[PDB]
Amino acid sequence: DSTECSNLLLQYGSFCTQLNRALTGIAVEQDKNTQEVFAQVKQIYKTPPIKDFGGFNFSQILPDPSKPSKRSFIEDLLFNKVTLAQKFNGLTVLPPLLTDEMIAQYTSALLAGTITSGWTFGAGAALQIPFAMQMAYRFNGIGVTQNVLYENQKLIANQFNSAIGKIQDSLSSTASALGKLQDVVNQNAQALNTLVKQLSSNFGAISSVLNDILSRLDPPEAEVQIDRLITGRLQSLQTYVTQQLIRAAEIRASANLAATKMSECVLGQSKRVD
Amino acid sequence: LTGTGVLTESNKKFLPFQQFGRDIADTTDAVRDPQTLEILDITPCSFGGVSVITPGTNTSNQVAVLYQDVNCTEVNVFQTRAGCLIGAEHVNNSYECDIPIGAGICASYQTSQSIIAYTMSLGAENSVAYSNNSIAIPTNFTISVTTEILPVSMTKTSVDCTMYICGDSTECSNLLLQYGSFCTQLNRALTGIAVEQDKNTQEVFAQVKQIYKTPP
Amino acid sequence: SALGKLQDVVNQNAQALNTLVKQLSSNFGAISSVLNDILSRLDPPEAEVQIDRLITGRLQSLQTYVTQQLIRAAEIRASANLAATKMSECVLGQSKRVDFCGKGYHLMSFPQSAPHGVVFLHVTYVPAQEKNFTTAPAICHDGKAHFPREGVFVSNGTHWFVTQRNFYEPQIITTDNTFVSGNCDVVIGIVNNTVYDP
Amino acid sequence: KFNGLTVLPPLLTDEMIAQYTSALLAGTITSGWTFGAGA
Ligand SMILES: *[C@@H]1O[C@H](CO)[C@@H](O[C@@H]2O[C@H](CO)[C@@H](O)[C@H](O)[C@H]2NC(C)=O)[C@H](O)[C@H]1NC(C)=O
Ligand SMILES: *[C@@H]1O[C@H](CO)[C@@H](O[C@@H]2O[C@H](CO)[C@@H](O)[C@H](O)[C@H]2NC(C)=O)[C@H](O)[C@H]1NC(C)=O
Ligand SMILES: *[C@@H]1O[C@H](CO)[C@@H](O[C@@H]2O[C@H](CO)[C@@H](O)[C@H](O)[C@H]2NC(C)=O)[C@H](O)[C@H]1NC(C)=O
Ligand SMILES: *[C@@H]1O[C@H](CO)[C@@H](O[C@@H]2O[C@H](CO)[C@@H](O)[C@H](O)[C@H]2NC(C)=O)[C@H](O)[C@H]1NC(C)=O
Ligand SMILES: *[C@@H]1O[C@H](CO)[C@@H](O)[C@H](O)[C@H]1NC(C)=O
Ligand SMILES: *[C@@H]1O[C@H](CO)[C@@H](O)[C@H](O)[C@H]1NC(C)=O
Ligand SMILES: *[C@@H]1O[C@H](CO)[C@@H](O)[C@H](O)[C@H]1NC(C)=O
Ligand SMILES: *[C@@H]1O[C@H](CO)[C@@H](O)[C@H](O)[C@H]1NC(C)=O
Ligand SMILES: *[C@@H]1O[C@H](CO)[C@@H](O)[C@H](O)[C@H]1NC(C)=O
Ligand SMILES: *[C@@H]1O[C@H](CO)[C@@H](O)[C@H](O)[C@H]1NC(C)=O
Numbered sequence: 001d002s003t004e005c006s007n008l009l010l011q012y013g014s015f016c017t018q019l020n021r022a023l024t025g026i027a028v029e030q031d032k033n034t035q036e037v038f039a040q041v042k043q044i045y046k047t048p049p050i051k052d053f054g055g056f057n058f059s060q061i062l063p064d065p066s067k068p069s070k071r072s073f074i075e076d077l078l079f080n081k082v083t084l085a086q087k088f089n090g091l092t093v094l095p096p097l098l099t100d101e102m103i104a105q106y107t108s109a110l111l112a113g114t115i116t117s118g119w120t121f122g123a124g125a126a127l128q129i130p131f132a133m134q135m136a137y138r139f140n141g142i143g144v145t146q147n148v149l150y151e152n153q154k155l156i157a158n159q160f161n162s163a164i165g166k167i168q169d170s171l172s173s174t175a176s177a178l179g180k181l182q183d184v185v186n187q188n189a190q191a192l193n194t195l196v197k198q199l200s201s202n203f204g205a206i207s208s209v210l211n212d213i214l215s216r217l218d219p220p221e222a223e224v225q226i227d228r229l230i231t232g233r234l235q236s237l238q239t240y241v242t243q244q245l246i247r248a249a250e251i252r253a254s255a256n257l258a259a260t261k262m263s264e265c266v267l268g269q270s271k272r273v274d
Numbered sequence: 275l276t277g278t279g280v281l282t283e284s285n286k287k288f289l290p291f292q293q294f295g296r297d298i299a300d301t302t303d304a305v306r307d308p309q310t311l312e313i314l315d316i317t318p319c320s321f322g323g324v325s326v327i328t329p330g331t332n333t334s335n336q337v338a339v340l341y342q343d344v345n346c347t348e349v350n351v352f353q354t355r356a357g358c359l360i361g362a363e364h365v366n367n368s369y370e371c372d373i374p375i376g377a378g379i380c381a382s383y384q385t386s387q388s389i390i391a392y393t394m395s396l397g398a399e400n401s402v403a404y405s406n407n408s409i410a411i412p413t414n415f416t417i418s419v420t421t422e423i424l425p426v427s428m429t430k431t432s433v434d435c436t437m438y439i440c441g442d443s444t445e446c447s448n449l450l451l452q453y454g455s456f457c458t459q460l461n462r463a464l465t466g467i468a469v470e471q472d473k474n475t476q477e478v479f480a481q482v483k484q485i486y487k488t489p490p
Numbered sequence: 491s492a493l494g495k496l497q498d499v500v501n502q503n504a505q506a507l508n509t510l511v512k513q514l515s516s517n518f519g520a521i522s523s524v525l526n527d528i529l530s531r532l533d534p535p536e537a538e539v540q541i542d543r544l545i546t547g548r549l550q551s552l553q554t555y556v557t558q559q560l561i562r563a564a565e566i567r568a569s570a571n572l573a574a575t576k577m578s579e580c581v582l583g584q585s586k587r588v589d590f591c592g593k594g595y596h597l598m599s600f601p602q603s604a605p606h607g608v609v610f611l612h613v614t615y616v617p618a619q620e621k622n623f624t625t626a627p628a629i630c631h632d633g634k635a636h637f638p639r640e641g642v643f644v645s646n647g648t649h650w651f652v653t654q655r656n657f658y659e660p661q662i663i664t665t666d667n668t669f670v671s672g673n674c675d676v677v678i679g680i681v682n683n684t685v686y687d688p
Numbered sequence: 689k690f691n692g693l694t695v696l697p698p699l700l701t702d703e704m705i706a707q708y709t710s711a712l713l714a715g716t717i718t719s720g721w722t723f724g725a726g727a
Binding site: 477478 | 492493495496499500503507514525526529538541542545548549552553556559560562563566567569570571572573574576577578582592593594597603604606607608609610611612613614615616617618619620621622623624625626642644653655656657658679
């Protein structure tokens with residue numbers, strides 16, 4: 001809100017477009033990460049209404065129709081474990097392309113394809129197969145004869161159900177497991193907070209308000225007093241942009257690792273140790 | 275205390291003896307009217323970037339703009355969750371995403387020869403015929419060939435300090451050296467980049483001890 | 491438009507160089523954008539002041555360009571490492587990692603060079619046409635339980651066969667395709683049929 | 689190359705890259721994966 005400050009500002013060349021271009025690239029990359037990680041299934045499969053899976057119980061991970069959103073129980077527990085736009089300077093936030101409902105639909109299609117088809121849905125088209133035989137195939141993968149499973153099916157089913165109960169109890173009880181997903185929010189909130197706080201620095205002038213200076217001095221010294229503020233705010237913006245670039249690179253590396261894990265661990269069986 | 279914003283009656287604030295209120299930054303948030311003593315809230319006027327949904331000029335020259343994060347009751351006018359869009363018509367159908375917009379809304383050019391804004395569809399619905407004693411076994415195959423292109427090395431470059439900052443001017447070079455070594459610390463980084471640009475190609479391609487040759 | 495990945499690098503490099511060169515045409519608060527004008531019109535005491543502000547502007551521009559180049563080079567190296575890994579694994583051998591050397595079951599790949607990049611031609615195996623059958627975990631013959639050595643038990647409505655899992659190729663059940671493991675009152679879903687002996 | 693900025697030429701020319709990809713393609717076709725381990 002200053003028609004005279006922007007006239008001295010435009011004397012600094014194209015320092016105003018580089019930051020916008022970099023931030024736009026960051027935004028595009030951050031949406032491409034999610035699009036690449038989740039959108040790995042061509043179609044949208046769904047589980048049959050009858051849950052006859054050889055004794056295994058997947059009710060705690062399948063979507064819950066009774067909920068307002070088509071989320072699972074563990075997903076609902078996860079969304080309540082993460083806490084935390086209100087700024088009103090030239091700072092805006094944009095909504096992601098894919099809403100949480102679409103992500104839930106993707107992870108439901110992936111999970112319902114994994115249960116029914118196994119790994120065949122990742123190569124060609126989904127091929128139905130009983131779960132009690134898919135699990136024998138998976139034990140045959142790790143050099144254990146399938147008669148071990150076929151003679152102990154109830155034991156493995158009970159152990160899997162107990163493990164699911166234990167994991168749900170652990171998620172519902174302890175809240176410190178999601179620190180990795182909490183820091184990615186805290187660091188950005190703190191960076192925006194510092195950027196906003198930088199607006200209240202003298203930087204060498206007599207006051208940190210443009211309207212205060214323009215209503216008290218003459219232009220020949222008003223421009224001198226405005227130059228320091230312009231320099232300080234430009235330096236703050238540049239530092240913020242550089243930090244954002246580095247953090248975005250780190251997040252992209254993490255997203256690539258997640259995409260590799262989804263491609264290998266989920267859509268197949270991995271012989272890579274640990 | 276000049277400025278700009280939207281005045282609003284704020285009975286929530288109290289200010290028993292305080293004249294003004296303020297926020298994290300040096301921006302006032304509440305003031306009291308000197309004539310009649312009540313507390314007024316100050317909220318800045320709405321603002322936001324402008325985006326232009328457009329098909330290629332090869333096809334046509336029809337556009338539709340979008341003011342994101344603007345409740346344009348003030349400004350065919352639509353209203354989405356990512357802002358508000360004028361110039362395109364809402365459609366109850368759902369197709370793939372052609373021009374992404376946001377919050378699950380995508381735009382595309384139909385035929386009518388107009389621009390439509392719909393909600394994207396994730397994929398064709400499918401449901402496997404799962405059963406506890408049923409299998410599906412392939413009887414035929416197909417061989418497919420896929421392309422995958424990825425870069426290896428960028429363009430090596432190097433710059434000169436004085437020749438750029440103080441080109442052919444002795445009194446400029448007589449002031450530049452007062453800053454110490456801000457020159458060599460840039461050329462060193464550029465040289466490192468140039469060296470790794472060759473290391474990348476050497477790693478990617480040089481993986482054979484001998485040069486093999488196909489029979490005639 | 492298939493080679494956008496390689497074109498983007500050139501486009502960004504050209505844009506960065508163009509912006510750096512065009513940054514020389516800004517006053518940065520000085521009277522003129524060419525120092526020759528200043529040194530030929532004003533006395534030293536403020537000519538040096540203008541020179542100093544020009545120097546600060548140009549030095550800041552160079553620092554910004556160098557930082558951007560460093561970040562882009564780091565990203566390019568990160569991509570080149572993946573390219574080298576693909577060349578080592580998909581080409582020089584056969585990879586069992588799912589969706590690493592192309593969709594489907596990987597067979598072999600062929601490398602091709604490109605301006606500032608590489609291109610792989612992954613050859614993959616994909617099943618095409620499917621059928622329906624009726625399986626069974628095992629089979630009783632004389633109170634025992636025969637399991638497939640490798641493959642599945644399938645039935646076309648009347649007869650039972652043993653076939654490989656990735657291709658339909660029925661064979662008569664025998665003692666060379668199955669192995670015995672105990673009695674068959676424990677397995678769930680077992681259906682009993684005759685087993686031929688050579 | 690007008691204001692003290694230069695571009696250096698790559699160490700590996702475009703012909704040696706082609707020679708590498710020809711050696712790789714000819715080893716792959718005629719030897720399988722055995723050419724990567726030993727001889
Ligand atoms: C799968 O597990 C769920 C939850 O562990 C089971 O649902 C419970 O069913 C009992 C009755 O048997 C109820 O008393 C509980 O309130 C249910 N819990 C929930 C969260 O709904 C379900 O029965 C199990 N299904 C199978 C086939 O084992
Ligand atoms: C397996 O699929 C291939 C095609 O992928 C079939 O080959 C085709 O057979 C038809 C005969 O009706 C010919 O007209 C085509 O020219 C063939 N295509 C090619 C590329 O050769 C093959 O017949 C199928 N095999 C079975 C047993 O169904
Ligand atoms: C299931 O497969 C069996 C074995 O191939 C079929 O039995 C043979 O069917 C052919 C018909 O093409 C006859 O010529 C043979 O004499 C049959 N052999 C025996 C031992 O019966 C059987 O017909 C198939 N059933 C169905 C419904 O397709
Ligand atoms: C496997 O074959 C045996 C016969 O050898 C079948 O056993 C019969 O089962 C019925 C009903 O369960 C009984 O009434 C008979 O007394 C059983 N006979 C014998 C000799 O045990 C058995 O049904 C067959 N398996 C299946 C799945 O049908
Ligand atoms: C003083 O302020 C009150 C506010 O209600 C106003 O009514 C009054 O006219 C003011 N005094 C004078 C002299 O204008
Ligand atoms: C672009 O225009 C050319 C003619 O100028 C036309 O041949 C071509 O099909 C157009 N491409 C698209 C994608 O519309
Ligand atoms: C937009 O403004 C209208 C009236 O101005 C109001 O009824 C509506 O609730 C507002 N919606 C949002 C999302 O601000
Ligand atoms: C979409 O459908 C709803 C109800 O099904 C209807 O109220 C609305 O007018 C429809 N929109 C269009 C553009 O036809
Ligand atoms: C197998 O049966 C299901 C339902 O009975 C059907 O949808 C599917 O198309 C069948 N498979 C083939 C290959 O026709
Ligand atoms: C398969 O399910 C049917 C009911 O849908 C049931 O009658 C049959 O016993 C089941 N078979 C096995 C092996 O569990």
